[PDB]
Amino acid sequence: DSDLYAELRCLCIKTTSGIHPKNIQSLEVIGKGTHCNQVEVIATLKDGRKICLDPDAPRIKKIVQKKLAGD
Amino acid sequence: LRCLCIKTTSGIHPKNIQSLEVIGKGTHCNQVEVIATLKDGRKICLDPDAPRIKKIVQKKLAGD
Amino acid sequence: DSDLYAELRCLCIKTTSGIHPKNIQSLEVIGKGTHCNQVEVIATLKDGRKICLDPDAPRIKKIVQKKLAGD
Amino acid sequence: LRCLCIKTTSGIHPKNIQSLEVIGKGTHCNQVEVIATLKDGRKICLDPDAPRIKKIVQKKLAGD
Numbered sequence: 001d002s003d004l005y006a007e008l009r010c011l012c013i014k015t016t017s018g019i020h021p022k023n024i025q026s027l028e029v030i031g032k033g034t035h036c037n038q039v040e041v042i043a044t045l046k047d048g049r050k051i052c053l054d055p056d057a058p059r060i061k062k063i064v065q066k067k068l069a070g071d
Numbered sequence: 072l073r074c075l076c077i078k079t080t081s082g083i084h085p086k087n088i089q090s091l092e093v094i095g096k097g098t099h100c101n102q103v104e105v106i107a108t109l110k111d112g113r114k115i116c117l118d119p120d121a122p123r124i125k126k127i128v129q130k131k132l133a134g135d
Numbered sequence: 136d137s138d139l140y141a142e143l144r145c146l147c148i149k150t151t152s153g154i155h156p157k158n159i160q161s162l163e164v165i166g167k168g169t170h171c172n173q174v175e176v177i178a179t180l181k182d183g184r185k186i187c188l189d190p191d192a193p194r195i196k197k198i199v200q201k202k203l204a205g206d
Numbered sequence: 207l208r209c210l211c212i213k214t215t216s217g218i219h220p221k222n223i224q225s226l227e228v229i230g231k232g233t234h235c236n237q238v239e240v241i242a243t244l245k246d247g248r249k250i251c252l253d254p255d256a257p258r259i260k261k262i263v264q265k266k267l268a269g270d
Binding site: 159160161162163164165166167168173174176190191195196199200202203204205 | 223224225226227228229230231238240245254255259260263264266267268269
Binding site: 004005006007008009011012014015016018033034035042047048049050051052053 | 139140141142143144146147149150151153168169170177182183184185186187188
């Protein structure tokens with residue numbers, strides 16, 4: 001809890017569960033660790049923009065399973 | 072440009088996974104690709120259709 | 136400026152060139168794009184902590200070249 | 207988990223690369239791995255020893 005100079009920790013303090021899966025190009029799930037003590041999910045949109053998703057949101061868990069499935 | 076993951080696995084323990092990237096099918100890759108990054112920086116492809124993997128993903132998402 | 140709700144843009148507003156190459160596990164170089172109009176370099180330390188490196192610093196460019204080479 | 211890049215390439219245009227990740231040799235992968243993510247989300251392995259790749263990396267760092 002004593003940051004190193006220029007250290008990058010958690011990326012997403014604000015999150016949403018309101019995205020349409022058809023607009024997502026890829027998804028990254030970053031588990032808890034020494035860099036940040038909360039799970040963070042980042043969705044990369046087809047246009048390159050990125051958005052912070054709520055890992056605990058039921059809708060987000062279902063979006064992740066459909067993606068895995070090729071849905 | 073094409074598929075990166077030609078060999079995949081389904082028996083990795085979740086304690087070792089730091090993060091996962093899920094990429095859908097595209098013009099030059101007709102399969103969903105799941106790349107896990109280990110705590111030691113090494114990377115591996117996971118079988119997206121194996122039930123063991125679907126559960127490891129849900130646990131990673133929940134803080135497991 | 137119009138950001139989408141919960142959008143993630145630039146990650147490193149503070150950067151440094153004072154890092155020892157031997158402590159770096161992996162390096163990520165993220166080019167400019169719609170998500171952020173400046174190059175960003177994130178070094179992941181052996182312990183998992185992450186730090187923002189200066190891409191324009193001669194010392195950083197040389198650290199990337201020795202890493203590519205297996206140093 | 208071990209070496210992810212068995213096939214690498216040295217002829218991709220930097221215009222297509224969004225980001226690169228460089229991973230050093232470890233206990234079970236005796237080669238530096240360079241994974242490029244294209245703007246379409248596909249991933250590819252780059253030959254770290256080729257001069258055309260060493261230069262593409264420097265252009266990326268420089269913002270070209």
